[PDB]
Amino acid sequence: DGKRFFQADPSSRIRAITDLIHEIPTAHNLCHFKHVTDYIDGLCEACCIKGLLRLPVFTTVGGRGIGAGINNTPPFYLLWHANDLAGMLAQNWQPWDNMGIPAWLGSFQKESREVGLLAGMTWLPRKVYLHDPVPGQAACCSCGLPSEALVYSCSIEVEPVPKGLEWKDPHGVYTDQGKSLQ
RNA sequence: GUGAACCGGAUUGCCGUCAGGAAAUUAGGUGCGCUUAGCAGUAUUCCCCACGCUGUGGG
Ligand SMILES: [Mg+2]
């Protein structure tokens, strides 16, 4: 009960924790290649963290009344590769003069125009709560690790992206007209 | 009992109506198939059996 990582205040729109993961079917999706059922199988803490990190980069439209993320349709992502973590960090180090405030800090604000790097790289288009883990002896449906109490449900609300918001992704690829290249 | 098990690309359709290969052509000029022979007057007729010191009977 306090500050949460990549989360916000609770709501009443209850959804099973499966829409954070694209490959596991949920709601109206057909469960043929992955036999799952909502509120029956859940994810562990590591998978919850890994699914909270997919919001800024891999969020698509929700149909009616729900928009996409900061990058609109998720485009190609091109970067540089190295044989170790330090090398990969050292080959894509280019900083900017304006950094902004990261999302894991205090309550993020859209505020005025311009974004920077830390704010843009951690844009949160949805509010999520991650209620609690429920005791049991099941296994995670994402990694398969035989574990203990998992989470099953959460609350998700939609945050619209204000008009304007001049942003250029360091890794995204754009077209001639400025649209995302997918 | 394997990125594995459970797993249909499915339903509908005439290529029909039109057409002279036609007009004219000697395949012609030369060439012996020829030299030779009794189905008959004999001297062991290819095989087998029986009777004699040639006669019967079968192939
Ligand atoms: Mg997990």
Automatic annotation (TrEMBL):
The residues that hold Zn(2+) are C47, C140, C143
Transmembrane regions: none
Residues where Mg(2+) 2 binds: C47, C143
Origin: domain of life: Bacteria
Per UniProt, where does Mg(2+) 1 bind? C47, C140, C143
Q: Where does Mg(2+) 3 bind?
A: C140
Q: What is the protein's given name?
A: CRISPR-associated protein Cse1 (CRISPR_cse1)
- The residues of the intact protein that this chain contains are 172 to 353 of 535
